[PDB]
Design a binder for this molecule. Structure first.
Ligand SMILES: [Cl-]
Ligand SMILES: [Cl-]
Lengths: 454, 454
């Protein structure tokens, strides 16, 4: 009866079921696997509306119409990338080196699901884990529980119809920290896909189980002197306002040069941004930064009007983002940190070199290894940013949120965006099927001992 | 500070701090400048081959002087020849079709755990690959090999620094403590752990909060299938199993033969210097090898046949090259079915290749899964079945186990850190090198709008 014990029991039950379900997947051919993958894609996509509405209603986060596009992306876009990849059995036979390469599935994948992008992340993690021959057990955020449970129900039913063994795709029905702890620590858990906060990722790397973790997204968008101002402002608003800023790859600040500063402020205003007065900025800043130095969860995925009301603000009805001018960087400077909300800091640099230095300083305090955006027509400046910005994905003339996940760019389509070693993670990739299998190499003898000691 | 544990913690924080600064200096260097240092390390390692082999032999008491010189040659010359022309620094790729550029990003400060079994060769190799990828490295020495490791570090460090490398980029703890090595693994500025050592050590690395890459126990069966060339299969198994008195983890731990071939195989093993133990002698050595706590006796590790025979109270001919015990069982309570880092083999008889496979899987699933299995066969179909099914990361065909698994007699990546992958509890199945020690940053240009994906 006690909730944590039942949760720990259920976790042990799901992993066991998932372990034997994977052994059955492992026996399947590439064609049999792809038949399953396409069926998960279709069920995910067919239920795009219902799951998007479910998630919005339960979490109170975002915009259901935007969650639909997240579901479409997680289904069709990921499917289209992964459909023709060889991920199963014999991959390569080098007949000159005499080395053969075979894909080995990891085993049971433990997927931690955020409340910010719940149904889309479930679909994405399922497609890529099953594609690589793995079973997946999900850890749902308590306040997106029903949405995630129905996503798992819908996609696992379609997979099982297409030949997938029962138990290969499952989810905790009783969310506890103790339960999630067990899922992570379990001997028969092969890898943790750790999409969550910084304490949750640190836990996953302290679990004993190999983990693939994320960091906070604190991505500046530098609008450089040669950028088309209208297009840059459009890209940023497209991303920042997408699902009320729930995607980690969305812009957290705008950096402008002195030459374009006012031209950019005016364009933001013209496209519906609201600039906070100095007084309005500190008032919201006081509300955003909690006494313990945490960022206020009360803003996450909420509307501009919702956030204004919480902060004691009165803001125009058609305001699309709140923007505050910022000069400093630090743990006590909330505008310099991740605000999963339609709230942006606004920085001014005199030159592109000053903008690079400020971005480094922003990223080093928070957001290193994740995302930075640059709007520019200058090939030389973009290349300097490419060689120096401490991120894993550097986005050029594109909306941040959409560009970072590979919706508007040719990055790998993903909702797990690895932050690399600088962010404390084991990978910097947009996670796909190639991150979820090992290579076994089968090598023939080419030399004798007598050759190597001569 | 005078207490040993606190002096050691202090040292590790100082060492990490220097390595942190030094890496930022390495991070500014071109591929040319890096490769110059790499070559200087390789040259210094190679030149000190006899010196360092003798130090390690005298200090640890393990192995054969001659064989450790070869390992020092392998770690320097062979690793260097694989890495010298590899692209590991800065801009790697510029895809103009996808509009995606790729840039190598060094991990940062590497933590190298060095075992007493392969101590000088492992330092040389890890240094070369870390520095090649633009990283610094701080070593944790096994206390039984402290002096030899420190002197290897001293030697390659000075040649690196003479070649342009920043001071503090290559360092080693001078006071080995478990409290100091815990600090090395857990530290925020430590970017990655190369975890070469025992099972409790690698489980410690994955519990540290820092990204780890671990090894597993090597327990590889050698299946001399009926199509095999017996005299060469025997020579290979002996070449590997007696190499440094069996200290390398990719060396064979059992021989599996088909019944039709058993007589012929035993006769050849005998001709080439193998000594088959009687039932009573096998039982006597088994009692000595297996400790009451369940661990295997360290007293046998890297020791001669005669030395072990004396320890176990056996009387064995002076020219005996390996001790072979016939075995029928697999399990924790069965010492021959487990990793014996010594010139000792189990010998199993199966009826068919199918039974040999099933037996091999049973061996590996108890101990050794993810590491190595060796097969001698001229049957490419049976080999392919083993390739697709045996739970290992490296499957060796017609080659000595120790020498083929490290890539000395095979075309596998030349390495002394052999990942066991997920099945063995690690993040990688690779023979690891430069490409496991940088992240890829991707710089991507927008190709689509929000409206397009709507
Ligand atoms: Cl979603
Ligand atoms: Cl050595």
């Amino acid at each position: 009866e006690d909730k944590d014990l039942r949760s720990i029991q259920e976790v042990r039950n799901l992993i066991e079921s998932a372990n034997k379900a994977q052994k059955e997947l492992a026996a399947m051919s590439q064609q049999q696997i792809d038949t399953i993958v396409k069926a998960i894609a279709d069920a995910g996509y067919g239920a795009r509306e219902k799951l998007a509405k479910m998630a919005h209603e339960e979490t109170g986060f975002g915009i259901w119409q935007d969650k639909v596009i997240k579901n479409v992306f997680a289904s069709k876009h990921v499917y289209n990338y992964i459909k023709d990849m060889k991920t199963i059995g014999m991959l390569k036979e080098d007949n000159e080196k005499k080395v053969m390469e075979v894909a080995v599935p990891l085993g049971v994948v433990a997927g931690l699901i955020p409340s910010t992008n719940p149904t889309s992340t479930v679909i994405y993690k399922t497609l890529i884990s099953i594609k690589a021959g793995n079973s997946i057990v999900f850890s749902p955020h308590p306040n997106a529980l029903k949405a995630i449970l129905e996503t798992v129900r819908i996609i696992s039913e379609a997979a099982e119809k297409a030949g997938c063994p029962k138990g290969a795709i499952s989810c905790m029905t009783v969310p506890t920290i103790q339960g999630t702890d067990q899922l992570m620590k379990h001997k028969d858990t092969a890898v943790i896909l750790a999409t969550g906060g910084s304490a949750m990722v640190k836990a996953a790397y302290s679990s004993g189980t190999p983990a693939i973790g994320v960091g906070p997204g604190n991505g500046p968008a530098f609008i450089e002197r040669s950028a088309n101002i209208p297009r840059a402002v459009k890209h940023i608003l497209d991303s920042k306002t997408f699902d009320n800023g729930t995607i980690c790859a969305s812009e957290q600040s705008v950096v402008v040069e002195r030459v374009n500063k006012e031209a950019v402020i005016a364009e933001f205003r013209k496209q519906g941004a609201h600039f906070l007065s100095d007084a309005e900025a500190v008032q919201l800043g006081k509300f955003i930064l909690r006494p313990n130095g945490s960022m206020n969860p009360a803003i996450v995925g909420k509307s501009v009007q919702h956030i204004a009301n919480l902060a004691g603000l009165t803001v125009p009805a058609d305001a699309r983002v709140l923007i505050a001018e910022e000069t400093k960087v630090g743990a006590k400077i909330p505008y310099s940190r991740e605000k999963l909300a339609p709230i942006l800091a606004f920085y001014t640099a005199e030159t592109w070199q000053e903008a690079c230095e400020l971005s480094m300083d922003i990223l080093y305090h928070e957001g290193a290894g994740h995302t930075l955006i640059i709007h520019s027509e200058d090939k030389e400046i973009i290349r300097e940013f490419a060689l120096k910005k401490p991120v894993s994905r550097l986005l050029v003339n594109t909306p941040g949120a959409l560009g970072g996940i590979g919706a508007t760019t040719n990055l790998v389509p993903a909702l797990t965006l690895g932050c690399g070693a600088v962010g404390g993670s084991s990978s910097s990739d947009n996670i796909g099927p190639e991150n979820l299998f090992n290579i076994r190499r089968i090598a023939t003898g080419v030399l004798e001992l007598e050759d190597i000691r001569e």
